[PDB]
Amino acid sequence: FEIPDDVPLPAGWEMAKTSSGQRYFLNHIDQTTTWQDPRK
C-alpha cells in the first residue's frame, strides 16, 4: 500500500556507495552491505 514516510533503514545502518556508482547500505548491525534496505 504505497510507501511509508518514516525511515529507510533502522539504526546501525549506513547508506553508502560501493561497486562504482550505486548506493548500498552498509549494515553495521551485522557487518554487511546490501543495495536495498531491510525496511521500505
Binding site: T18, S19, L26, Q31, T32, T33, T34
Partner: peptide, 5 residues
Amino acid sequence: PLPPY
C-alpha cells in the same frame, strides 16, 4: 559483487 564488509 557487493562490498564484503
